[PDB]
Amino acid sequence: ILSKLATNESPYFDGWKAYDSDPFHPLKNPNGVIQMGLAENQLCLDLIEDWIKRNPKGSISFKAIANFQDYHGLPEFRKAIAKFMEKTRGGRVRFDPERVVMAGGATGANETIIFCLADPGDAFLVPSPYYPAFNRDLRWRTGVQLIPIHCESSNNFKITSKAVKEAYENAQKSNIKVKGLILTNPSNPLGTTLDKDTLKSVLSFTNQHNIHLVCDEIYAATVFDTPQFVSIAEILDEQEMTYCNKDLVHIVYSLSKDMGLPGFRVGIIYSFNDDVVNCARKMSSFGLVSTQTQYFLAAMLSDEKFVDNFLRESAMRLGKRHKHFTNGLEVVGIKCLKNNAGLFCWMDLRPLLRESTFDSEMSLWRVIINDVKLNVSPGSSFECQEPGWFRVCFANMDDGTVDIALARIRRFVGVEK
Amino acid sequence: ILSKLATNESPYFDGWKAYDSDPFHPLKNPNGVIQMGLAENQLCLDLIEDWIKRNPKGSISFKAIANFQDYHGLPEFRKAIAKFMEKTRGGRVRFDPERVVMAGGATGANETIIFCLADPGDAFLVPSPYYPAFNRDLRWRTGVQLIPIHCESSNNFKITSKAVKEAYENAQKSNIKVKGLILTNPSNPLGTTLDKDTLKSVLSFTNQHNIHLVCDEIYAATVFDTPQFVSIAEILDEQEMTYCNKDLVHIVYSLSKDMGLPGFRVGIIYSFNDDVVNCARKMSSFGLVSTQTQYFLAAMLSDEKFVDNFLRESAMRLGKRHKHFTNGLEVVGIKCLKNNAGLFCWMDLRPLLRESTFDSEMSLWRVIINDVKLNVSPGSSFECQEPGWFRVCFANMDDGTVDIALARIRRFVGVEK
Ligand SMILES: *Cc1c(COP(=O)(O)O)cnc(C)c1O
Ligand SMILES: *Cc1c(COP(=O)(O)O)cnc(C)c1O
């Protein structure tokens, strides 16, 4: 007899294996599937390598980091993260390192914050489309459930007050304890930063009902165009809202996107609620960052010229690449939701859809992965309520590869009417 | 409004507290409380630093590892762990790197293996005295309960098949669904390796009631005297036990205790159940070892010479220290449970008590941690059913410190009769 969790254990994985069974490689398999489904940021690893070399060395006082095992981590780590989080939000706000908490990547930060704010049975509101890991991350071992907040293309998938309320009030009508709402800002798969007002309109609805607002700002430093990224933190430093319960406000973070170090498993939880801060720290012991990696990060994120050079450079490349991939599709007549951040773009393949069904959508998908041989992500995968949208990632390959993927798309669409 | 867990939150911390305030140190505080309550293994860190000055690439391919994020881990990591797990258990039984799963230290390994085996409300049998962290690790976020199994000093704290049946049936009459039994072998705080025949018994009864047998063999490579350490994996290999169902047997391991690298968070789950293996893997996303620590370790553990000398040296240093420490305590009449493993000894201070009540043990405990300035652990914190026993860790300090500590003890005992 295994537990229910293990005992209760594949459709959207089609592109996943199509890739694994035929990965594109310039020399080994130049016609294989090109991985465009993982939101990875490798445009600036070279800059990190240059650093790990000379400016200075950093990684290995071994005994100290080898035996250190406090749920608080190395002081410099906390300081560096808080420091790094600051520059990311244009110094517009400050972060108290004593509040910095660790988790096994954003994965663990998410599961932990949920464990800290909701009981099994309770529900959390999530705007859609939304990162699918949530379905497991926020729901698998927490028992908590999800309730989507509708979003259309007609308004660029913006989060509207009416929609936030409608979803919420329906839950009450369904006797479902709603304890919070979890945003992703910058957005995934939308790749767009949230409008200052929109955030206030959410925090307020959140505050007005004493429910928590969990901001997943894991894509903060991947902004590359206007508008500016507005942290929920910055909205807690504004007069118009000096009277908001800071107990219902939590931020989730990681170093996976704006430094591309997912393997380092650097999950961060920054609560404004002292109690939550603690529980998350006690829970942080199940997913503590490696002292070796902590030591490595403290040193690295402490170099301002670097942390300041990296941030600026990283914004450039991402923009340089996004624009290219954007013009690339504008050429063959493909439109994307306009975005300013992230490691991907929300592609509109609606004009290729026969009818307007998710089935029609999945078929187009089977073609892109078997015949176009590109592994992209189908909108229905992010719980998108309208067929035709596909998330396409462009930050994990060469310019050469991108242009190929672009060339392949040219033929597909070209032969589509 | 936080969750029940977050809201459901210091008696035995006077020791950890005292130490933090008046921390011992040869020059700047020769009379600070000595840290003898942490099971840290520092006797061979010098061995690791030495090694760190050679072959191969101790720590940098960077883009590859910085981005590698497969729940399976770096290619060479699983194999290294398995080869290490073999050298450990004699090299007599074999381990399959494909079945090796990560977790955040033993802490994460433990919580996960329970998440996989029992549902909230279910219970697990635990011999006592036992590892206090279990009370959080095994029950907090799992809704699982622990059921103690009686052990006394009349029989050197051995687990008797009678004692096991009693807890099992006692629990059933009360309608508690026992889903498994979790051992610690080598033992914490007893610091003893388990009698092969005893394992064969626990496994028979275990297999005979369809409940899981989880083994925390986190202390496998700290044996410094006979008998030899017998892994449950070896038991699954004898002819006399061919019909035991391998679906119900599992191993929890880590590098914290034997390798002295707790800050590395190298938790390992090794299940003989293929489903558990799959589930545990899905769960590893929450607590994965850092690709950097993985790389480093793959390189260290892939060095047969280092590994041989390390294990061999560790056994001798832990052997020289343990004996020296016990011979000192005997000089003054103080005796401990006879052990061949661990990084501590089960000290019997029953004759320094006033009454066989935990109220006397705690009275003495304070004396020991304020006036003698030694931070140890009171038997009752290990759920030990009889007062007077204390766990005293002797593997993290210098030879100089141990004698200082012994000296303080030689005194306290002196002025007590
Ligand atoms: C990629 C991604 C993550 C992953 O963060 P990890 O630290 O690697 O677990 C989390 N959230 C979103 C929205 C992502 O796109
Ligand atoms: C020390 C210990 C642990 C903790 O292992 P970590 O890797 O440091 O988390 C777990 N279980 C037992 C029985 C221990 O002795």
PDB file of C-alpha atoms in Angstrom, chain B residues 39-274:
ATOM      1  CA  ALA B  39      26.214  15.233  15.754  1.00  0.00           C
ATOM      2  CA  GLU B  40      28.712  16.881  13.429  1.00  0.00           C
ATOM      3  CA  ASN B  41      31.585  14.829  12.011  1.00  0.00           C
ATOM      4  CA  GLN B  42      34.713  16.972  11.738  1.00  0.00           C
ATOM      5  CA  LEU B  43      37.475  14.449  12.372  1.00  0.00           C
ATOM      6  CA  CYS B  44      38.235  14.073   8.650  1.00  0.00           C
ATOM      7  CA  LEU B  45      37.586  17.454   7.100  1.00  0.00           C
ATOM      8  CA  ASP B  46      41.335  17.850   6.818  1.00  0.00           C
ATOM      9  CA  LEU B  47      41.231  14.814   4.549  1.00  0.00           C
ATOM     10  CA  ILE B  48      38.755  16.546   2.229  1.00  0.00           C
ATOM     11  CA  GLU B  49      40.665  19.859   2.099  1.00  0.00           C
ATOM     12  CA  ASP B  50      43.840  17.953   1.201  1.00  0.00           C
ATOM     13  CA  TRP B  51      42.017  16.227  -1.621  1.00  0.00           C
ATOM     14  CA  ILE B  52      40.504  19.522  -2.775  1.00  0.00           C
ATOM     15  CA  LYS B  53      44.060  20.449  -3.774  1.00  0.00           C
ATOM     16  CA  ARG B  54      44.318  17.964  -6.673  1.00  0.00           C
ATOM     17  CA  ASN B  55      42.252  15.895  -9.203  1.00  0.00           C
ATOM     18  CA  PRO B  56      40.047  16.270 -11.160  1.00  0.00           C
ATOM     19  CA  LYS B  57      37.966  19.395 -11.619  1.00  0.00           C
ATOM     20  CA  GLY B  58      36.816  20.037  -8.074  1.00  0.00           C
ATOM     21  CA  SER B  59      34.431  22.765  -9.157  1.00  0.00           C
ATOM     22  CA  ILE B  60      34.027  24.935 -12.263  1.00  0.00           C
ATOM     23  CA  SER B  61      30.786  22.805 -18.734  1.00  0.00           C
ATOM     24  CA  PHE B  62      29.413  25.505 -16.394  1.00  0.00           C
ATOM     25  CA  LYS B  63      26.524  26.484 -18.664  1.00  0.00           C
ATOM     26  CA  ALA B  64      25.609  22.807 -18.803  1.00  0.00           C
ATOM     27  CA  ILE B  65      25.482  22.280 -15.051  1.00  0.00           C
ATOM     28  CA  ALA B  66      24.208  25.770 -14.283  1.00  0.00           C
ATOM     29  CA  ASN B  67      21.277  24.836 -16.464  1.00  0.00           C
ATOM     30  CA  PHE B  68      21.081  21.078 -15.952  1.00  0.00           C
ATOM     31  CA  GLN B  69      17.786  20.497 -14.222  1.00  0.00           C
ATOM     32  CA  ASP B  70      16.849  16.817 -14.689  1.00  0.00           C
ATOM     33  CA  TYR B  71      15.405  15.241 -11.519  1.00  0.00           C
ATOM     34  CA  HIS B  72      17.795  12.413 -12.338  1.00  0.00           C
ATOM     35  CA  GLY B  73      20.817  14.648 -11.891  1.00  0.00           C
ATOM     36  CA  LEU B  74      24.272  14.929 -13.437  1.00  0.00           C
ATOM     37  CA  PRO B  75      25.276  11.670 -15.232  1.00  0.00           C
ATOM     38  CA  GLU B  76      28.115  10.763 -12.863  1.00  0.00           C
ATOM     39  CA  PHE B  77      26.356  11.774  -9.627  1.00  0.00           C
ATOM     40  CA  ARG B  78      23.997   8.782  -9.235  1.00  0.00           C
ATOM     41  CA  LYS B  79      26.780   6.316 -10.089  1.00  0.00           C
ATOM     42  CA  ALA B  80      29.155   7.928  -7.612  1.00  0.00           C
ATOM     43  CA  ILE B  81      26.592   7.808  -4.835  1.00  0.00           C
ATOM     44  CA  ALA B  82      25.888   4.129  -5.558  1.00  0.00           C
ATOM     45  CA  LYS B  83      29.577   3.204  -5.678  1.00  0.00           C
ATOM     46  CA  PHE B  84      29.886   5.100  -2.401  1.00  0.00           C
ATOM     47  CA  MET B  85      26.886   3.338  -0.948  1.00  0.00           C
ATOM     48  CA  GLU B  86      28.571   0.058  -1.854  1.00  0.00           C
ATOM     49  CA  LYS B  87      32.039   0.741  -0.422  1.00  0.00           C
ATOM     50  CA  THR B  88      30.025   1.727   2.648  1.00  0.00           C
ATOM     51  CA  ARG B  89      28.012  -1.451   3.055  1.00  0.00           C
ATOM     52  CA  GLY B  90      31.158  -3.522   2.496  1.00  0.00           C
ATOM     53  CA  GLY B  91      30.914  -3.510  -1.292  1.00  0.00           C
ATOM     54  CA  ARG B  92      29.199  -6.867  -0.839  1.00  0.00           C
ATOM     55  CA  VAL B  93      25.722  -5.747  -1.989  1.00  0.00           C
ATOM     56  CA  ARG B  94      25.090  -3.821  -5.196  1.00  0.00           C
ATOM     57  CA  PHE B  95      23.324  -0.515  -5.809  1.00  0.00           C
ATOM     58  CA  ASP B  96      21.680   0.702  -9.002  1.00  0.00           C
ATOM     59  CA  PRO B  97      22.479   4.343  -9.776  1.00  0.00           C
ATOM     60  CA  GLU B  98      19.204   4.447 -11.717  1.00  0.00           C
ATOM     61  CA  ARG B  99      17.282   3.993  -8.474  1.00  0.00           C
ATOM     62  CA  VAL B 100      19.172   6.791  -6.698  1.00  0.00           C
ATOM     63  CA  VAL B 101      16.924   9.756  -5.858  1.00  0.00           C
ATOM     64  CA  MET B 102      17.826  13.140  -4.331  1.00  0.00           C
ATOM     65  CA  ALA B 103      16.194  15.148  -1.529  1.00  0.00           C
ATOM     66  CA  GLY B 104      17.125  18.017   0.784  1.00  0.00           C
ATOM     67  CA  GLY B 105      19.407  16.138   3.134  1.00  0.00           C
ATOM     68  CA  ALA B 106      18.047  13.315   5.245  1.00  0.00           C
ATOM     69  CA  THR B 107      15.457  15.839   6.441  1.00  0.00           C
ATOM     70  CA  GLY B 108      13.903  15.995   2.995  1.00  0.00           C
ATOM     71  CA  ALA B 109      14.492  12.297   2.321  1.00  0.00           C
ATOM     72  CA  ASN B 110      12.546  11.429   5.458  1.00  0.00           C
ATOM     73  CA  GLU B 111       9.586  13.737   4.849  1.00  0.00           C
ATOM     74  CA  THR B 112       9.323  12.534   1.286  1.00  0.00           C
ATOM     75  CA  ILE B 113       9.529   8.817   2.001  1.00  0.00           C
ATOM     76  CA  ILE B 114       6.620   9.270   4.434  1.00  0.00           C
ATOM     77  CA  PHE B 115       4.707  11.374   1.911  1.00  0.00           C
ATOM     78  CA  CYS B 116       5.077   8.378  -0.420  1.00  0.00           C
ATOM     79  CA  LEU B 117       4.200   5.631   2.071  1.00  0.00           C
ATOM     80  CA  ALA B 118       1.524   7.019   4.363  1.00  0.00           C
ATOM     81  CA  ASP B 119      -1.530   9.250   4.178  1.00  0.00           C
ATOM     82  CA  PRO B 120      -2.300  11.923   6.775  1.00  0.00           C
ATOM     83  CA  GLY B 121      -3.673  10.224   9.873  1.00  0.00           C
ATOM     84  CA  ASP B 122      -1.695   7.066   9.315  1.00  0.00           C
ATOM     85  CA  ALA B 123       1.124   6.100  11.657  1.00  0.00           C
ATOM     86  CA  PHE B 124       4.657   4.724  11.542  1.00  0.00           C
ATOM     87  CA  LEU B 125       6.362   2.684  14.238  1.00  0.00           C
ATOM     88  CA  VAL B 126       9.574   4.172  15.647  1.00  0.00           C
ATOM     89  CA  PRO B 127      11.964   2.556  18.054  1.00  0.00           C
ATOM     90  CA  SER B 128      13.064   4.867  20.862  1.00  0.00           C
ATOM     91  CA  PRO B 129      15.086   6.597  22.081  1.00  0.00           C
ATOM     92  CA  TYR B 130      14.962   8.294  18.686  1.00  0.00           C
ATOM     93  CA  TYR B 131      16.146  11.228  16.588  1.00  0.00           C
ATOM     94  CA  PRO B 132      14.123  14.253  17.800  1.00  0.00           C
ATOM     95  CA  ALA B 133      13.981  15.852  14.352  1.00  0.00           C
ATOM     96  CA  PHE B 134      11.728  12.939  13.362  1.00  0.00           C
ATOM     97  CA  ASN B 135       8.886  14.567  15.277  1.00  0.00           C
ATOM     98  CA  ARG B 136       8.877  17.369  12.706  1.00  0.00           C
ATOM     99  CA  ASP B 137      10.365  15.659   9.674  1.00  0.00           C
ATOM    100  CA  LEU B 138       8.001  12.717   9.739  1.00  0.00           C
ATOM    101  CA  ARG B 139       4.844  14.459  11.036  1.00  0.00           C
ATOM    102  CA  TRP B 140       4.674  18.187  10.400  1.00  0.00           C
ATOM    103  CA  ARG B 141       3.640  18.643   6.751  1.00  0.00           C
ATOM    104  CA  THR B 142       2.597  15.015   6.412  1.00  0.00           C
ATOM    105  CA  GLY B 143      -0.242  14.591   8.898  1.00  0.00           C
ATOM    106  CA  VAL B 144       1.502  11.374   9.833  1.00  0.00           C
ATOM    107  CA  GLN B 145       1.907  10.166  13.395  1.00  0.00           C
ATOM    108  CA  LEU B 146       4.697   8.332  15.154  1.00  0.00           C
ATOM    109  CA  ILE B 147       4.172   5.408  17.479  1.00  0.00           C
ATOM    110  CA  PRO B 148       7.033   4.733  19.933  1.00  0.00           C
ATOM    111  CA  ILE B 149       8.419   1.268  20.590  1.00  0.00           C
ATOM    112  CA  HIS B 150       9.681   0.538  24.089  1.00  0.00           C
ATOM    113  CA  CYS B 151      13.410   0.184  24.746  1.00  0.00           C
ATOM    114  CA  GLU B 152      15.250   0.085  28.063  1.00  0.00           C
ATOM    115  CA  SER B 153      18.819  -0.127  29.285  1.00  0.00           C
ATOM    116  CA  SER B 154      18.106  -3.490  30.919  1.00  0.00           C
ATOM    117  CA  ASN B 155      18.830  -4.985  27.477  1.00  0.00           C
ATOM    118  CA  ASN B 156      21.213  -2.344  26.111  1.00  0.00           C
ATOM    119  CA  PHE B 157      18.346  -0.601  24.297  1.00  0.00           C
ATOM    120  CA  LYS B 158      17.744  -3.376  21.773  1.00  0.00           C
ATOM    121  CA  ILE B 159      14.593  -3.649  19.665  1.00  0.00           C
ATOM    122  CA  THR B 160      12.839  -6.906  20.559  1.00  0.00           C
ATOM    123  CA  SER B 161      10.326  -8.528  18.210  1.00  0.00           C
ATOM    124  CA  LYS B 162       7.976  -8.705  21.195  1.00  0.00           C
ATOM    125  CA  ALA B 163       8.268  -4.959  21.738  1.00  0.00           C
ATOM    126  CA  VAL B 164       7.438  -4.466  18.064  1.00  0.00           C
ATOM    127  CA  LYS B 165       4.342  -6.667  18.053  1.00  0.00           C
ATOM    128  CA  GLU B 166       2.990  -4.904  21.136  1.00  0.00           C
ATOM    129  CA  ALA B 167       3.171  -1.423  19.611  1.00  0.00           C
ATOM    130  CA  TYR B 168       1.641  -2.733  16.418  1.00  0.00           C
ATOM    131  CA  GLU B 169      -1.386  -4.360  18.084  1.00  0.00           C
ATOM    132  CA  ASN B 170      -1.708  -1.637  20.722  1.00  0.00           C
ATOM    133  CA  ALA B 171      -2.067   0.765  17.815  1.00  0.00           C
ATOM    134  CA  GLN B 172      -4.658  -1.391  16.042  1.00  0.00           C
ATOM    135  CA  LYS B 173      -7.016  -1.725  18.990  1.00  0.00           C
ATOM    136  CA  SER B 174      -6.928   2.083  18.971  1.00  0.00           C
ATOM    137  CA  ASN B 175      -7.634   1.821  15.228  1.00  0.00           C
ATOM    138  CA  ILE B 176      -4.447   3.518  14.098  1.00  0.00           C
ATOM    139  CA  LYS B 177      -3.436   2.425  10.619  1.00  0.00           C
ATOM    140  CA  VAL B 178       0.265   1.577  10.811  1.00  0.00           C
ATOM    141  CA  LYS B 179       1.626   1.907   7.306  1.00  0.00           C
ATOM    142  CA  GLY B 180       5.235   1.229   8.268  1.00  0.00           C
ATOM    143  CA  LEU B 181       8.150   1.088  10.709  1.00  0.00           C
ATOM    144  CA  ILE B 182      11.236   3.283  10.436  1.00  0.00           C
ATOM    145  CA  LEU B 183      14.607   2.210  11.853  1.00  0.00           C
ATOM    146  CA  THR B 184      17.840   4.085  12.261  1.00  0.00           C
ATOM    147  CA  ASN B 185      20.822   1.793  11.791  1.00  0.00           C
ATOM    148  CA  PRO B 186      23.519   2.598  12.764  1.00  0.00           C
ATOM    149  CA  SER B 187      21.590   4.050  15.717  1.00  0.00           C
ATOM    150  CA  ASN B 188      21.069   7.628  16.932  1.00  0.00           C
ATOM    151  CA  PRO B 189      21.486   8.253  19.976  1.00  0.00           C
ATOM    152  CA  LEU B 190      22.551   4.696  20.891  1.00  0.00           C
ATOM    153  CA  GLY B 191      25.367   4.873  18.352  1.00  0.00           C
ATOM    154  CA  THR B 192      25.020   1.134  17.782  1.00  0.00           C
ATOM    155  CA  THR B 193      24.802  -0.939  14.596  1.00  0.00           C
ATOM    156  CA  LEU B 194      21.972  -3.471  14.495  1.00  0.00           C
ATOM    157  CA  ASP B 195      22.296  -7.212  15.058  1.00  0.00           C
ATOM    158  CA  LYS B 196      21.807  -8.917  11.664  1.00  0.00           C
ATOM    159  CA  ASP B 197      19.340 -11.355  13.155  1.00  0.00           C
ATOM    160  CA  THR B 198      17.460  -8.413  14.621  1.00  0.00           C
ATOM    161  CA  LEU B 199      17.072  -6.796  11.191  1.00  0.00           C
ATOM    162  CA  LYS B 200      15.917 -10.125   9.798  1.00  0.00           C
ATOM    163  CA  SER B 201      13.214 -10.130  12.509  1.00  0.00           C
ATOM    164  CA  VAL B 202      11.997  -6.580  12.022  1.00  0.00           C
ATOM    165  CA  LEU B 203      11.851  -7.325   8.283  1.00  0.00           C
ATOM    166  CA  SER B 204       9.894 -10.584   8.714  1.00  0.00           C
ATOM    167  CA  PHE B 205       7.205  -9.068  10.964  1.00  0.00           C
ATOM    168  CA  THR B 206       7.313  -6.059   8.686  1.00  0.00           C
ATOM    169  CA  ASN B 207       6.810  -8.052   5.507  1.00  0.00           C
ATOM    170  CA  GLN B 208       4.310 -10.311   7.281  1.00  0.00           C
ATOM    171  CA  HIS B 209       1.874  -7.398   7.851  1.00  0.00           C
ATOM    172  CA  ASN B 210       2.349  -5.589   4.584  1.00  0.00           C
ATOM    173  CA  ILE B 211       3.865  -2.485   6.199  1.00  0.00           C
ATOM    174  CA  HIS B 212       6.943  -0.630   4.972  1.00  0.00           C
ATOM    175  CA  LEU B 213      10.348  -0.846   6.523  1.00  0.00           C
ATOM    176  CA  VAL B 214      12.249   2.411   6.092  1.00  0.00           C
ATOM    177  CA  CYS B 215      15.912   2.411   7.071  1.00  0.00           C
ATOM    178  CA  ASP B 216      17.806   5.556   7.947  1.00  0.00           C
ATOM    179  CA  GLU B 217      21.324   4.288   7.424  1.00  0.00           C
ATOM    180  CA  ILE B 218      22.679   7.813   7.475  1.00  0.00           C
ATOM    181  CA  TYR B 219      25.431   6.662   9.885  1.00  0.00           C
ATOM    182  CA  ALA B 220      26.604   3.674   7.785  1.00  0.00           C
ATOM    183  CA  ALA B 221      30.190   4.876   7.404  1.00  0.00           C
ATOM    184  CA  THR B 222      30.847   5.849  11.025  1.00  0.00           C
ATOM    185  CA  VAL B 223      31.265   2.373  12.431  1.00  0.00           C
ATOM    186  CA  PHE B 224      34.605   2.302  14.284  1.00  0.00           C
ATOM    187  CA  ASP B 225      34.456  -1.151  15.855  1.00  0.00           C
ATOM    188  CA  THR B 226      32.850  -4.565  15.441  1.00  0.00           C
ATOM    189  CA  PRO B 227      30.346  -5.950  14.719  1.00  0.00           C
ATOM    190  CA  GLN B 228      30.188  -4.838  11.082  1.00  0.00           C
ATOM    191  CA  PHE B 229      27.458  -2.606   9.716  1.00  0.00           C
ATOM    192  CA  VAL B 230      24.721  -4.691   8.068  1.00  0.00           C
ATOM    193  CA  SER B 231      22.586  -2.802   5.535  1.00  0.00           C
ATOM    194  CA  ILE B 232      18.985  -3.812   4.966  1.00  0.00           C
ATOM    195  CA  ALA B 233      19.953  -4.113   1.296  1.00  0.00           C
ATOM    196  CA  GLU B 234      22.275  -6.986   2.262  1.00  0.00           C
ATOM    197  CA  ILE B 235      19.411  -8.676   4.089  1.00  0.00           C
ATOM    198  CA  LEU B 236      17.276  -8.509   0.972  1.00  0.00           C
ATOM    199  CA  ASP B 237      20.000 -10.558  -0.688  1.00  0.00           C
ATOM    200  CA  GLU B 238      20.079 -13.641   1.540  1.00  0.00           C
ATOM    201  CA  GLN B 239      18.460 -16.934   0.471  1.00  0.00           C
ATOM    202  CA  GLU B 240      16.735 -17.096   3.837  1.00  0.00           C
ATOM    203  CA  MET B 241      14.738 -14.001   2.808  1.00  0.00           C
ATOM    204  CA  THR B 242      14.026 -14.410  -0.919  1.00  0.00           C
ATOM    205  CA  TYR B 243      10.251 -14.209  -0.401  1.00  0.00           C
ATOM    206  CA  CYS B 244      10.324 -10.899   1.388  1.00  0.00           C
ATOM    207  CA  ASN B 245       8.359  -8.362  -0.705  1.00  0.00           C
ATOM    208  CA  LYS B 246      10.764  -5.701  -1.912  1.00  0.00           C
ATOM    209  CA  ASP B 247       7.860  -3.308  -2.430  1.00  0.00           C
ATOM    210  CA  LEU B 248       7.920  -2.514   1.265  1.00  0.00           C
ATOM    211  CA  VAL B 249      11.641  -1.875   1.878  1.00  0.00           C
ATOM    212  CA  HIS B 250      13.421   1.472   1.567  1.00  0.00           C
ATOM    213  CA  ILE B 251      16.604   3.303   2.511  1.00  0.00           C
ATOM    214  CA  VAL B 252      17.150   6.898   3.622  1.00  0.00           C
ATOM    215  CA  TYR B 253      20.729   8.109   3.357  1.00  0.00           C
ATOM    216  CA  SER B 254      22.776  11.312   3.355  1.00  0.00           C
ATOM    217  CA  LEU B 255      26.380  12.578   3.293  1.00  0.00           C
ATOM    218  CA  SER B 256      25.942  14.830   6.339  1.00  0.00           C
ATOM    219  CA  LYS B 257      26.961  12.342   9.005  1.00  0.00           C
ATOM    220  CA  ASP B 258      29.533  10.296   7.119  1.00  0.00           C
ATOM    221  CA  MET B 259      31.441  12.765   4.937  1.00  0.00           C
ATOM    222  CA  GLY B 260      30.756  15.637   7.326  1.00  0.00           C
ATOM    223  CA  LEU B 261      28.953  17.770   4.718  1.00  0.00           C
ATOM    224  CA  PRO B 262      25.541  18.726   6.120  1.00  0.00           C
ATOM    225  CA  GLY B 263      25.611  22.146   4.475  1.00  0.00           C
ATOM    226  CA  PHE B 264      25.572  20.327   1.147  1.00  0.00           C
ATOM    227  CA  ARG B 265      22.023  19.025   1.587  1.00  0.00           C
ATOM    228  CA  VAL B 266      22.714  15.694  -0.108  1.00  0.00           C
ATOM    229  CA  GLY B 267      19.634  13.685   0.792  1.00  0.00           C
ATOM    230  CA  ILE B 268      19.203  10.308  -0.832  1.00  0.00           C
ATOM    231  CA  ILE B 269      16.190   8.046  -1.147  1.00  0.00           C
ATOM    232  CA  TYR B 270      16.817   4.496  -2.325  1.00  0.00           C
ATOM    233  CA  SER B 271      13.665   2.417  -2.677  1.00  0.00           C
ATOM    234  CA  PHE B 272      13.345  -1.217  -3.769  1.00  0.00           C
ATOM    235  CA  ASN B 273       9.861  -0.237  -4.947  1.00  0.00           C
ATOM    236  CA  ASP B 274       9.758   1.074  -8.525  1.00  0.00           C
TER     237      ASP B 274
END
